[PDB]
Design a protein around this ligand. Structure first.
Ligand code: FES
Ligand SMILES: [K+]
Ligand SMILES: [Mg+2]
Ligand SMILES: [Mg+2]
Ligand SMILES: [Mg+2]
Lengths: 108, 168, 110, 215, 51, 119
RNA sequence: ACAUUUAACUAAAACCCCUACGCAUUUAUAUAGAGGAGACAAGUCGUAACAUGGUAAGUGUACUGGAAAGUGCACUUGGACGAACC
RNA sequence: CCCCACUAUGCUUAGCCCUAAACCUCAACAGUUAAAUCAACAAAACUGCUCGCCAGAACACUACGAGCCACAGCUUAAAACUCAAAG
RNA sequence: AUAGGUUUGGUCCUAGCCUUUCUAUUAGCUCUUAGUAAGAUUACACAUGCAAGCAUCCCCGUUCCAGUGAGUUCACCCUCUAAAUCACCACGAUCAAAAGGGACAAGCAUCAAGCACGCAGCAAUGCAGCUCAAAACGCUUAGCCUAGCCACACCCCCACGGGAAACAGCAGUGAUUAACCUUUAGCAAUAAACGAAAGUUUAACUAAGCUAUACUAACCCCAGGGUUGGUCAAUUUCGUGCCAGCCACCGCGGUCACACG
């Protein structure tokens, strides 16, 4: 653009940073509503443990449960964080292991 | 690269090289130059190069420019007292014009030196406080004083926890 | 003087004469673009008191700040019609000019 | 550009000011005191401990003038304070008295007078202060002459004091630096400074007044 | 003094101009007359053509 | 800011760290915070002795004259500092305190001499 | 909305227009029901595109078809025409 | 897709509608072939000046809003979810 | 940026997304112990302790300080001129409101017209103008340009009166959050109150108690977190067999996995 055009337009402003599934929060606290397994997209093939939780903001979301083996049942309090599961489309939250009812993974 | 012809005119260094700081009396400067005509060559170079330099050192003076309104390029200054100052600038190089107006309406070197001295007095080297305004912040930054308990923990004697253990 | 009005002297161009004994004047001031470091003209309108209603749309006039604002928006008066629209008198020679041409030769009537 | 007028603010502003005038508390109401608890029932405040005795002891200004014809216009009245602490006669020459008609005993109100110190009468009469204080004591007529007897003491007083250490050292150098060789000890003119007594009656016109609301 | 000096400078410049203006017109006039004479000749010839 | 009543006062602004005070002579308002806005800084005061054993009291005396000439008041500890400096006379209560101390210490020699006599 | 005074040998008392929820208005959230897109990738039906893609492709527009799409009219090359004569 | 037949339509008149690969996808004006031409390809690389446009893909010549003689229209024109590419 | 990884069968050019760097908050796992600096998520409710008195009666203070960030071009300049302070019916400086003139956030133009927003006249009345694509008028976001300032003080912008008994003063609570300080002393320092004053209060403040939030200093004893396919410093042997699980990006795993445990 010309200098006259660059003046008339001004600074480049900025796209207002879109919030994440966690709503700009380090973590969020949810209530387990159900626990199921969703199969990843190809080329990958598995049955990844997810769970639908109701966040403290009202919005319900599917959260991936990391680690090997979970003991989460309905109406339990979990702490969820960010970080998308690259294999599972749509899943974008992750249960924190070792907080509230979700305990650490058993050694064996 | 930077846009425009002669991009140097859009740099602070070039804008701070202006030597014409009008007296407090000058309020409005009008430039009536011509766009064509060899006689007015100096007049338009002054508008191309120096009006940026003038307006910078003189941010409150209203500079106004008019093209091809009269057969001759001329300046005019409006002083606060009500005196107006026609400076005919036909057949005169832009640097000559730059020095002409400096002579008749520019501050002398004495006035500028005096103003620079005022800034020196604002920053008193002794005043302690935020480095945004001062040199040092505490007096523990002066050599040979009592240091700050942060870097070097002071003797238990000086600390108000063990001299109070001696009080009680 | 004690002029309460901020802008004491300002040269502008008449852009309106519909109001009574008041000329609307446009005043442009070069402002520094901080990013591009180029000066562009930022314009604002000023109401000027013209008791004699001698201003036409297109005259370059000089406005002097009134000691006290006459009206809500009238703070200046017509100090001088610097350039009369199409009736400019060469301020260097004093001879009537039409644009960049001396209408009457300076040698005709001295 | 335009600001929304805060109208209710202005309404209540006027309303409050007016209502205070209409409900002005009287001197008999403001300056009443319970001699049992030694607290003014209006504001429930305890007077200072060093005033407890004097309160129960002496009497107020218009407590004396209450029983005098025209409230003793033209009569000379001094206060216990002046008497006890100072020997020079100090008194008020009463000129006008506005008693508080609401008082059951007419022992409250205002009073004006002219102070005459060392034979100099003030150009105007001004209100008497501490009217509610239990200090005032009426001068018996038959000894007015003895009480008003005053002998002008000699005016011999101090005229100039030495400068403090640092200032003196600096003034000299200024003189010396300029070129003045005169070694005349620089001093002040404290004589001009009239050191008024600390207990001199102040201007009641500048003193405030309690609001209708105790709080 | 500086304002009086400026006016003298403007006056000095005015003399240089007023002389220059005269010299240019004197030379132009001779050139102008020749151009006008050329025009007249062309017009006269063309008038003969129509006649 | 516009305060509802007050006067220019020359005070000491408390800086420094915990158990490490350091004062700043400042011309402020009678209602501004102690460490808040001030009009002008008129010096400093190190209340703790330096490596050479002195208390360091810088005083912009030239400007102190101007501020006092405009109505600047002075706080109690500030008055006492100008006394010890010699710019103002010694504070009255300062003297009375020395006397009280010396009269306390008069009692002390009576009691301390006895202690040494016994043991 | 009304203002109408007493007092007056020191001068002082008295001195207050009243009016507020039509769930009106404003912007959202929830949705009986109806659609759309995207993802997902082993179903079904055809084979439109990519080669002259087996009728070159597409643009606008119109009409017409289970579905890709078909056809008209104009336009484009982001097709080609084999590059002396034959 | 091929053949035959026939209509709207193509024409005139009077109003609408306002869209195209409306693309020679290459703006107007003033200039330069000197340099280092110069990513590829295409129709060689550039300077001054101004205006108009653009800022991953796809959602999207879409939705809402607004205007319009246009009511299956046109012009302006997003977002959410999705992707690690698209080109 | 001194850059790097990633489009493809491959190569160039564009291009976005990531990586490497520095902070702050929260979590997991750890967490010997010395100074200093900081320390509710919430303008949503509070146990009911404590924070405004001093002064020989008046007056003065309690309007400051300390809080909070809900609302928000009233913060800065200029012109006039208050109220304060300078012992003073005189009256000049300093300081600083109201008023007048300029200046002054960020997005959205799919917010394009606003709807009386102007001038003249001493007036009665005449004029019909004023702003605006160089962004008027709106809508939504935000305390701000930290020697600090602005705004707010239980809601109704305000607070006569209503709604109702108010901690956005300190310490402390069940609630609500990812967001876990003590129901400690003292007025000698300390500034601010009160009389001229000895002086007398102050949850301001000064000293302490807590908290790996950060910064210095430490040790005979006192090391754990994460990572180890490439980008990117650094895996031996076993189980697992597209399962279980793992990645910030490319991507690993199908019985010989440096990528999982
Ligand atoms: S910085 Fe000087 S006492 Fe801490
Ligand atoms: K086809
Ligand atoms: Mg096909
Ligand atoms: Mg085909
Ligand atoms: Mg084809």
């Amino acid at each position: 653009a010309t200098l006259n055009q660059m003046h008339r337009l001004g600074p480049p402003k900025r796209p207002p940073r879109k919030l994440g599934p966690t709503e700009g929060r380090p973590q969020l606290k949810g209530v387990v509503l159900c626990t199921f397994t969703r199969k990843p997209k190809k080329p990958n093939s598995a049955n990844r443990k997810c769970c639908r939780v109701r966040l403290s903001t009202g919005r319900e979301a599917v959260c991936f449960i990391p680690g090997e083996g979970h003991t989460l049942q309905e109406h339990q309090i979990v702490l969820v964080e960010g970080g998308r599961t690259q294999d599972l489309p749509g899943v974008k939250l992750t249960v924190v292991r070792g907080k509230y009812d979700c305990g650490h993974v058993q050694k064996k | 690269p930077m846009k425009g012809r002669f991009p140097i005119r859009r740099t602070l260094q070039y804008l701070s090289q202006g030597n014409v700081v009008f007296k407090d009396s000058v309020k409005v400067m009008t430039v009536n130059y011509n766009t064509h005509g060899e006689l007015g060559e100096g007049a338009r170079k002054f508008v191309f190069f120096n009006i940026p330099q003038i307006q910078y050192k003189n941010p409150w003076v209203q500079i106004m420019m008019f093209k091809n309104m009269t057969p001759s390029p001329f300046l005019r200054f409006y002083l606060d007292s009500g005196e107006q100052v026609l400076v005919d600038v036909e057949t005169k190089s832009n640097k000559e014009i730059m020095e002409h107006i400096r002579k008749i309406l520019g501050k002398n070197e004495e006035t500028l030196r005096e103003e620079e001295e005022e800034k020196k007095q604002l920053s008193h080297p002794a005043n302690f406080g935020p480095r945004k305004y001062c040199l040092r912040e505490c007096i523990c930054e002066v050599e040979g004083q009592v240091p700050c308990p942060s870097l070097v923990p002071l003797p238990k004697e000086m600390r108000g926890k063990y001299k109070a253990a001696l009080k009680a | 003087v004690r002029s309460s009005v901020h802008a004491r002297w300002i040269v502008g161009k008449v852009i309106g004469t519909k109001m009574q004994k008041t000329a609307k004047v446009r005043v442009t001031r070069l402002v520094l673009d901080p990013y591009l470091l180029k000066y562009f003209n930022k314009r604002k309108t000023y109401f000027a008191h013209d008791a004699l209603q001698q201003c036409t749309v297109g005259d370059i006039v000089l406005l002097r700040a009134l000691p006290v604002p006459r009206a809500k928006h009238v703070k200046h008066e017509l100090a001088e019609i610097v350039f009369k629209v199409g009736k400019v008198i060469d301020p260097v020679t004093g001879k009537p000019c039409a644009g960049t041409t001396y209408l009457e030769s300076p040698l005709s009537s001295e | 550009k335009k600001v929304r007028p805060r109208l209710i603010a202005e309404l209540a502003r006027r309303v409050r000011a007016l209502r205070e005038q209409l409900n002005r508390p009287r001197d008999s109401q403001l300056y009443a005191v319970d001699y049992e608890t030694l607290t003014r029932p209006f504001s429930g405040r305890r007077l200072p401990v060093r005033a407890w005795a004097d309160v129960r002891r002496e009497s107020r200004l218009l407590q004396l003038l209450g029983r005098l014809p025209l409230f003793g216009l033209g009569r000379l009245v001094t206060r216990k304070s002046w008497l006890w602490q100072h020997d020079e006669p100090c008194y008020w020459r009463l000129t006008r008295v506005r008693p508080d008609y609401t008082a059951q005993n007419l022992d409250h109100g205002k009073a004006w007078g002219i102070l005459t110190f060392k034979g100099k009468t003030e150009s105007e009469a001004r209100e008497i202060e501490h009217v509610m204080y239990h200090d005032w004591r009426l001068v018996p007529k038959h000894e007015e002459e003895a009480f008003t007897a005053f002998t002008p003491a000699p005016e011999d007083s101090l005229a100039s004091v030495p400068y403090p250490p640092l200032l003196r050292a600096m003034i000299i150098a200024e003189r010396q630096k300029n070129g003045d060789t005169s070694t005349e000890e620089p001093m002040l003119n404290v004589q001009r400074i009239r050191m008024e007594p600390w207990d001199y009656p102040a201007k009641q016109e500048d003193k405030g007044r309690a609001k209708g609301t105790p709080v | 003094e500086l304002m009086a000096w400026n006016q003298a400078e403007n006056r000095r410049l005015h003399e240089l101009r007023i002389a220059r203006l005269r010299q240019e017109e004197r030379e132009q006039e001779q050139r102008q007359a020749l151009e006008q004479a050329r025009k007249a000749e062309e017009v006269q010839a063309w008038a003969q053509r129509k006649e | 800011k516009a305060y509802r009543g007050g006067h220019l006062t020359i005070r000491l602004a408390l800086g420094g760290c915990t158990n490490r005070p350091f004062y700043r002579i400042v011309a402020a308002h009678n209602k501004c915070p102690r460490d808040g806005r001030f009009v002008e800084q008129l010096g400093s005061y190190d209340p703790l002795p330096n490596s050479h054993g002195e208390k360091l009291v810088a005083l912009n005396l030239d400007r102190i004259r101007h501020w006092i000439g405009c109505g600047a008041h002075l706080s109690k500890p500030m008055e006492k500092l100008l006394g010890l400096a010699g710019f103002f006379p010694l504070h009255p209560m300062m003297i009375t305190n020395a006397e009280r101390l010396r009269r306390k210490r008069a009692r002390e020699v009576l009691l301390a001499s006895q202690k040494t006599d016994a043991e």
